[PDB]
Amino acid sequence: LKSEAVALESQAPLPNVTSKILAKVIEYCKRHVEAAASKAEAVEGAATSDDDLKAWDADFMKIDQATLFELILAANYLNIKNLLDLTCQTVADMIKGKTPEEIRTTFNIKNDFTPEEEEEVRRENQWAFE
Amino acid sequence: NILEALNVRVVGTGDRILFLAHGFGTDQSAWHLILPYFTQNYRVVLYDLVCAGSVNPDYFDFNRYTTLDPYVDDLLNIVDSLGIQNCAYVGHSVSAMIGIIASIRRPELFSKLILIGFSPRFLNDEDYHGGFEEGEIEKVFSAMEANYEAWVHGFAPLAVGADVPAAVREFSRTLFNMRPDISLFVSRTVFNSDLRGVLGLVRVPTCVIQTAKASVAEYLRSHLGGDTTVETLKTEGHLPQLSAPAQLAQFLRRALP
Amino acid sequence: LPEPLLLHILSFLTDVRSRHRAALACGRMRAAERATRSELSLRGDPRSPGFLFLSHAFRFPALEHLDLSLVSPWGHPLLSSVISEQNAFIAARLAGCFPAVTSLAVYCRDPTTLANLTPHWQASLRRVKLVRWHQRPPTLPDGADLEPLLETCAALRELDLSEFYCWTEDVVRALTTHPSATAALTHLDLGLAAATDGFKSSELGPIAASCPNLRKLVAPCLFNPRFSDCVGDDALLSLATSCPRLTVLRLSEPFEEAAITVAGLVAFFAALPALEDFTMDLQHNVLEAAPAMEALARRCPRIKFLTLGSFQGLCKASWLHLDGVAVCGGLESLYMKNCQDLTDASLAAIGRGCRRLAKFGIHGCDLVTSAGIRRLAFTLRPTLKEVTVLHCRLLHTAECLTALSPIRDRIESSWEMLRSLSLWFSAGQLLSPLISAGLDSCPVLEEISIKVEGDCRTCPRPAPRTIFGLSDLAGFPVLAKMKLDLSEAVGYALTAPTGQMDLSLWERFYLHGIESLQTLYELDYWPPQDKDVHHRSLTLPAVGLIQRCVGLRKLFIHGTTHEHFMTFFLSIPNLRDMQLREDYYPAPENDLMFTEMRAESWLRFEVQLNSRQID
């Protein structure tokens, strides 16, 4: 299909996720053919801690360059859990060491908190974690 | 108010009132082992004293606690505020000094003075052995000033039995257990304080209990004006009430009413 | 910038310091949308909420797990009877702030803390954890402590007594006499503060019987043969036959042949087919184990995680004995006098996912078969070799094979993927030599644990200007979580006899590096114990040196101190979480003035702690 083999996963051609955006969606989706199919191969034993662990190699790749930001809305359009879960997690890891300044730098966000509100909504957080 | 700031605490059930005054280095929890030996036939009164670790350091007024006298103003203030006409008084060891003064100052108010690890001055004189040689005492100050001048300017003070311990480390060990400025302040009011020309002015009867190996006993036995039993314990130590309390519990019950 | 599907991004956060920045110290589009659904179900709070809990839109509707056990002051009984509107006023607003709590943890000094907390969450409440290091109230019924839960809270599936001190008889009574509730359980930890000499057979057998549906049971039991009432071959059977739905069973003999034989164990494992996770950890031993271990694989196919105590001859030499057992994800053999180079070699045929091996106190096993294993199993990532392994003494740091990959390491005394390291020093032993010129270089080491045992009173006076080289850990550059546990080091506290020396030396000796670990960010300091008093408390040097760790946000002292020594830590500029956590049985004051500390003091200290400007 356009912006056909093994596109079964999504909630089975539509301009919303256009070619640039949907291109990526195919990369990860047919990489999960290896994950499904390598269970069927090869010899009786295992050989089965490369999906559970080592398949996450290219999961933690493939997310060089957001937006991306619009890939979440594409992974939302197509109701595909394991891809949303993946990119939504990798946005998490951006919001970690970032101070509330550094968050709204690398996520273009308008600081609107009046210092009236702000340090009271802060004093909310001194009632946890200790 | 003073009763709050100085954590006074009354515990047992009885008519006879027992006052338990801790030493300098410690606080009132030094008495926690001994307390229940007497807590069932006595109203036991305890206080933390202003220079102890567990009192706020803000109540240390540095241009007030310059001599032993204001420590005594506190003791008598406490007693008056609880409204105690008479009590027996266990004091160790600067708080023995404080007890002696308070009983000269107010002999109505004490059944008996029981003074653990008492000496009237700790600066051993050319005559005679009542305390520690000034060479040693000097070394103890020499260690606390390091700690004070570490404490500002924000550095860790690390002076403990980095010392010399003639008879001195065990004594001075506990002194370090306060805020270093206050340690130094109350450490000097310990060694400059002499009250051996006040002993024969003591009317109320006194039992000294002394920690183990002419020496001291025979001096203060003759010189105290009250009736003067001097018992000595079996085992050494600054704090017979923490080490060895089952024993000190006995000498205490034996030196009462 | 999308909406409202940020709550799925936000929910994989998970660090609690980050969720505070974005959002509640940042912009609106998260500072309601985080405090609403995405709170990640967890909040362990700080201050007495029977003081000025004044808030308004402080509501967490998807909050599942709440933790009122670190609530301060730390020991104190929370809203019990020794007026109930003061309690119920607080319980209401705790329900208001967090409804839909499924999982609770509290510090249950007496049962009424429970009768006054639960009935709001009565319907939602699945797991409960009780915490009590203090003496039991000595006059309760004695099913008493557990009663309020089993009667009111009718969805109670899980129960975590791991750190709730009890008599063994409270557990017996409460669990055997609420059949409807007790026969609905699935998870049970009866390690009662590690205080009891274990559960007896007469005690254990009927607890199992009263809980037919149970999947995880974790407990200490009395194993010594010389008793009429040990857990043995029959008792284990009656455990298994009374609740076979067990997937996880962990069973440890406490301490300071015998009555379990392969005969019985085979009959035992035969009754428990669902067994995944199994541990028997005893001092008294099982003799030929091989036949019993085979049966474990034969009868429990799912068996993966297993750790065995004193269990002799698990595996002999060729052919296949403990190795019959296919699926072991993680194995820890614990006390074997018969586990040889040969046996290590072989169980290379258990590299299903041996991701964890461990040898504790197994002497005839050489530094060498070890190389064997890390070779043959090359996805083996945490390991542990310990306290009396005679041949391996940091020669077996110099074992290489898995230094590319081992994610954790434990040992008594590049590495390019060490996350977590755990040392066991003794007495006054030095750190730097036997670790850092042993083998040194760990560019991802974050957490490090140090334990020291014991008896300084019979040590030499660490040569003037000696140290425990905490400073030589400054090399490791993502090392942000420390845990220096001197607790089991006994000493003289405020007054040592003549010739001996007090602990402030030993605290110095130990703590004297930590200024230099600039990566440091979370310290857990257990100070040492004086033979006979049960307050562990800091001395001058300790507070002075800990004060200098300028980059800690969290500091936790498993002991106490007085108010003079408390204020040292306010100097630490961004230090935020600070508590005295006396989590050891028996834990002692305040209704008694037993230690240097007073709650008056710490409640005051805690104001100055979050009345400074902190990031």
C457 touches chain B (CB under 8 A): no
Polymer length of chain B: 257
SS3 C487: coil
Instruction: Name, in order, each residue with C-beta under 8 angstroms of B179's C-beta and a sequence gap of 6 or more.
Output: B53, B57, B151, C564, C565, C567
Q: Which residue is it, tokens 């003061």?
A: C86
Contact call for C9 and A103, based on CB within 8 A: no
Residue with tokens 């570490």: B150
| Torsional sign, CA B56, B59, B61, B65 | negative
- For residue C243, count CB atoms less than 10 angstroms from its CB and return exposed for 0-12, middle for 13-18, buried for 19 or more: buried
Rounded Cα distance, C575 and C547, in Å: 10
Angle of helix C233-242 relative to helix C201-210, nearest 10 degrees, comes to 10
Integer Cα distance of C305 and C53 in angstroms: 45
B89, HSE (Cβ side, Cα atoms, 13 Å): 29
Torsion, Cα of C386, C389, C390, C391 (10° steps)? -100
- Which pair of tokens denotes residue C485? 């546990």
Same domain, yes or no: C351 and C425: yes
Distance CA C329, CA C355 (A): 6
Do residues B83 and B77 lie in contact, with contact meaning Cβ atoms separated by under 8 Å?
A: no
Q: Return d(Cα C496, Cα C502) in angstroms, integer.
A: 6
- In this complex, the residue of C24, C28, C44 whose CB is nearest that of residue A125 is C24
**Which of B3, B177, B185, B213 to mutate: most C Cβ within 10 Å?**
B177
Query: Considering CB atoms only, which of A84, A100, A112 is closest to C21?
Result: A100
Residues of chain B contacting residue C457, judged by C-beta atoms under 8 Å apart: none
Largest CA distance in chain C: 73
Under 8 Å between Cβ of C531 and C490: yes
Rounded CA separation C494/B139 (Å): 20
What CA–CA distance (Å, rounded) separates C585 from C167?
A: 13
Distance from CA of B229 to the nearest CA of C (A): 26
Breaks (C-N over 2.5 A) in chain C follow: 82, 256, 413
Q: What is the DSSP letter of C555?
A: E
- The CA angle A14-A16-A21, to the nearest 5 degrees, is 105
H/E stretch holding C384 reads strand C382-385
Q: How was this structure determined?
A: X-ray
C-alpha–C-alpha distance, residues C359 and C392, integer Å:
10
Question: SS3 letters for chain B?
Answer: CHHHHCCCEECCCCCCEEEEECCCCCCHHHHCCCHHHHCCCCEEEEECCCCCCCCCCCCCCCCCCCCCHHHHHHHHHHHHHHCCCCEEEEEECHHHHHHHHHHHHCHHHEEEEEEECCCCCCECCCCCCCCECHHHHHHHHHHHHHHHHHHCCCCCCCCCCCCCCCCHHHHHHHHHHCCHHHHHHHHHHHHCCCCCCCHHHCCCCEEEEECCCCCCHHHHHHHCCCCEEEEECCCCCCCCCCCCHHHHHHHHHHCCC
Phi, psi of C376 (to 5 degrees): -95, -40
Q: Please give the DSSP secondary-structure letter assigned to residue C537.
A: B
Question: Residue C267, SS3?
Answer: helix
What angle, 0 to 180 degrees and rounded to 10, lies between the N-to-C axes of helices B69-82 and B94-105? 70
Candidates B39, B38, B36, B59; CA nearest to B49 is B59
CA distance A51 to chain C (A): 13
> How would you class C535 by CB atoms within 10 Å of its CB: exposed for 0-12, middle for 13-18, buried for 19 or more?
buried
What residue has token string 């750790």? C307
Cα gap C435→C554, rounded to integer Å: 26
Residues of B with a known catalytic role: 93, 238
Asked if A95 lies within 8 A of C615 by C-beta distance, the reply is no
C-alpha–C-alpha distance, residues C536 and C561, integer Å: 9
Cα end-to-end span (Å), chain C: 26
| Cβ-based contacts of B156 with chain C (< 8 Å) | 515, 541, 544-545, 547-548
Ramachandran class of B77: left when φ > 0, alpha when ψ lies in -120 to 50, beta otherwise: alpha
Say what the resolution is, in angstroms. 3.3
Same domain, C537 and C453: yes
- Residue B204: how many other CB atoms lie within 10 Å: 22
Compute the CA torsion angle C477, C481, C487, C490 (nearest 10 deg): 10
Please tell me which of the candidates B48, B56, B236 has its beta carbon nearest to residue C498.
B236
Q: Nearest-CA neighbor of C613 among A56, A126, B225?
A: A126
Give helix then strand counts, H and E, for chain C: 20, 22
How many beta carbons lie within 10 A of that of residue C594, not counting itself? 18
Q: Which two tokens stand for residue B48?
A: 């933390």
Judged by a CB distance cut-off of 8 A, whether residue C553 touches chain B is no
Report yes or no: C246 and C277 within 8 Å, Cβ to Cβ: no
What is A1-130's CATH number, 3.30.710.10, 3.90.420.10, 3.20.20.70, 3.40.30.10?
A: 3.30.710.10
**What tokens does C388 get?**
């009396």
Q: Give the DSSP letter of residue C350.
A: G
Say yes or no for a CB contact (<8 Å) between C541 and B25: no
* Mode of pairing for the β-strands spanning C158-164 and C127-132: parallel
- By the 10 Å C-beta count (0-12 exposed, 13-18 middle, 19+ buried), B108 is classed as exposed
Alpha-carbon radius of gyration of chain C: 26
**Do C159 and C276 have their domain in common?**
yes
**With an 8 Å Cβ cutoff, are C22 and A98 in contact?**
yes
Q: Which two tokens stand for residue B210?
A: 């002394």
Nearest to residue C297, comparing CAs of C251, C255, C267, C328?
C328
Give me the amino acid identity at C72. S
Contact residues on chain B for C498, CB-CB shorter than 8 A: 165, 170, 236
Cα C463 to Cα C476: distance, rounded to the nearest angstrom:
27
The residue with tokens 């309601």 is C32
How is residue C492 annotated by DSSP? B
If interface means Cβ-Cβ distance under 8 Å, which residues of chain B face chain C? 7, 9, 25-29, 32-33, 46, 48, 52-57, 147, 150, 154-161, 165, 170, 173-174, 176-180, 182, 235-239, 242-243
Instruction: Give the side-chain half-sphere CA count within 13 A for C176.
Output: 17
Residue C115, phi then psi, degrees to nearest 5: -60, -25
Q: What is the 3-state secondary structure (H, E, C) of chain A?
A: CCCCCCCCCCCCCCCCCCHHHHHHHHHHHHHHHHHHHHHHCCCCCCCCCCCCCCCHHHHHCCCCCCCCHHHHHHHHHCCCHHHHHHHHHHHHCCCCCCCHHHHHHHCCCCCCCCHHHHHHHHCCHHHCCC
Amino acid at A17: V
Q: Which residue in C10, C27, C44 is closest to A109 by CB distance?
A: C27
C277-281 and C306-310 as β-strands: parallel, antiparallel, unpaired? parallel
Cβ(B225)–Cβ(B202) below 8 Å: yes
C27 residue type, one letter? G
Peptide bond into C382 cis (omega under 30): no
Cβ atoms of residues B204 and B112 within 8 Å: yes
**CB-based contact C561:C598 (threshold 8 Å):** no
What are the extents of the domains in chain B?
1-257
Interface test with A, best of C3, C19, C24, C613 (most A CBs within 10 A): C24
The count of residues in chain C is 615
Note every long-range contact of A65-70, with CB atoms under 8 Å and residues 24 or more positions apart, other chains counting: A66/A91, A69/C1, A69/C2, A70/A21
Domain that holds residue C10: 1-39
Contacts within 8 Å (CB) and 24+ apart, B26-29:
B26/B52, B26/B174, B26/B177, B26/B239, B26/C494, B27/B52, B27/B53, B27/B54, B27/B55, B27/C562, B27/C596, B28/B52, B28/B54, B28/C593, B29/B54, B29/C589, B29/C593, B29/C594, B29/C595, B29/C596
The closest of C136, C58, C127, C92 to C586, measured between CA atoms, is: C136
d(CA A52, CA C101): 32
Token pair for C322: 């403990």
Count the Cβ atoms, other than its own, within 10 Å of residue C461: 12
Which residue of chain C has the CA closest to A86? C9
Contacting residues for B3 by C-beta, under 8 A, at least 6 apart: B78, B81, B82
**How far does C104 lie from chain A, in Å, by closest CA?**
15
Contact state of C24 with A92 under an 8 Å Cβ cutoff:
no
Architecture of domain B1-257: 3-Layer(aba) Sandwich (3.40)
Query: Buried b / exposed e across B9-37, counting CB within 10 Å, b at 16+?
Result: bebbeeebbbbbbbbbbbbbbbbbbbbeb
| End-to-end CA gap in chain A | 54
Q: SS3 letters for C424-462?
A: EEECCCCCHHHHCCCCCCCCCCCEEEEEEECCHHHCCCC
The candidate with the shortest Cα–Cα distance to B10, out of B41, B52, B38, B47, is B47
Run of H or E including C121: helix C118-121
Instruction: List the beta bridge partners of residue C50.
Output: none
Q: Which amino acid is present at C16?
A: V
- Is residue C19 domain-shared with residue C64, that is, in the same domain? no
Cβ separation C598–B235 shorter than 8 A: no
Q: Are C563 and B55 inside 8 Å of each other by CB?
A: yes
> Residue C294 to residues A101, B118, C238, C241, C314: CA-CA distances in angstroms?
60, 73, 21, 20, 9
Single-letter amino acid code for the residue at B194? D
Question: How many angstroms from the chain centroid is the CA of residue C193?
Answer: 11
Q: Do B160 and C505 touch (CB under 8 A)?
A: yes
CA distance B29 to chain C (A): 5
Sheet containing strand B43-47, strands side by side: B9-10, B43-47, B17-21, B87-92, B110-116, B206-210, B228-232
Of B7, B147, B155, the CB nearest to C598: B7
Q: How far is CA A22 from CA A3, A59, A73, B234, C600, in A?
A: 7, 17, 11, 90, 64
Both tokens of residue C217?
A: 């049971």
Query: In this structure, are residues C263 and C289 in contact, taking their beta carbons and an 8 Å threshold?
Result: no
Task: Identify any residues that bridge with B198 across adjacent strands, giving them in sequence order.
Answer: none
Residue C21 carries which DSSP code?
I
Tokens of C558: 């498993």
Of C21, C352, C379, nearest to A103 by CB-CB distance is C21
| Distance in Å, alpha carbon of A7 to nearest chain C alpha carbon | 24
- Determine the Cα–Cα distance for residues C554 and C572; give it in Å rounded to an integer: 10
Alpha-carbon torsion angle C571, C572, C578, C581, nearest 10: -90
A116: left (phi over 0), alpha (psi -120 to 50) or beta: alpha
- Give the CA dihedral B176, B88, B247, B219, nearest 10 degrees: 70
- Name residue C128's beta-bridge partners: C104, C159
The answer to whether the beta carbons of residues B76 and B33 sit under 8 Å apart is no
Measured between alpha carbons, how far is C534 from A94 in angstroms, rounded to an integer? 46
Query: Token pair for residue C142?
Result: 């004695």
Cα-to-chain-centroid distance, residue B118: 8
Which tokens hold the place of C531?
Answer: 């033979």
Secondary structure E strands in C194-340: 216-220, 248-252, 277-281, 306-310, 330-335
Helices C262-271 and C290-299, axial angle in degrees (round to 10): 10
A and C touching (3 or more beta-carbon pairs closer than 8 Å): yes
Instruction: Give the best residue of C494, C504, C592 to mutate against chain B (max B CB count within 10 A).
Output: C494
**Contact call for residues B200 and B106 (beta carbons, < 8 A):** no
Q: Which helix (H) or strand (E) holds C120?
A: helix C118-121
Half-sphere exposure of C275 (CA within 13 A, CB side): 27
Cα–Cα distance for residue pair C216/B156, rounded to 1 Å? 49
- The C-alpha angle C456, C459, C462, rounded to 5 degrees, equals 105
Interface test with C, best of B1, B20, B29 (most C CBs within 10 A): B29
